[PDB]
Amino acid sequence: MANRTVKDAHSIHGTNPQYLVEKIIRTRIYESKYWKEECFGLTAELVVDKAMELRFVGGVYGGNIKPTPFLCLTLKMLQIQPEKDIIVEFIKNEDFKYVRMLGALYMRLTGTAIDCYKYLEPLYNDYRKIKSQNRNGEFELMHVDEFIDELLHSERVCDIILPRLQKRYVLEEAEQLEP
């Protein structure tokens, strides 16, 4: 496999971080023009360059499950496992909505329960419109805060089954979050 997770990488949710994405979707990503041309040899520090070019959020689309750039870059991030501050920088970035959303999804996929609430909840204040490519290929609009709500409460976002997230009440009782 030429697209293995980097050797220094540690497991996430008890597995290879890339495994959070369905195998058949990974295969489609690895054979895509965007992965081959835009993602090759991407390093943690260079992801932001490609993220700033994103134009919508999305997973896969169409009958034969074509991957969106957003999803391709998510998988590349899972493969290279950027340092936490890169992800936080993305989430905090005021310049680029889609960089924020990419960081938010990645944090939801890989962060501790505490970090999910801590870093994603402030984005409920972001009412800005974002474009989304629907599973059927059509473009739709939603708000940033709605995407965050899906990250914190839905089972699947951008065609990725989200890992188990402990309920906020439990963290509060363990002195891990402010109630």
Swiss-Prot record:
Sequence segments annotated as region (N-terminal protein interaction domain): 1-179
Recorded consequence of changing residue 145 to A: Loss of interaction with MFAP1
Source species, domain of life: Eukaryota
Keywords: Coiled coil, mRNA processing, mRNA splicing, Nucleus, Phosphoprotein, Spliceosome
Residue numbers of Phosphoserine PTMs: 11
Family stated for the protein in its record: Belongs to the PRP38 family.
Protein name: Pre-mRNA-splicing factor 38A
Organism: Homo sapiens
Gene: PRPF38A
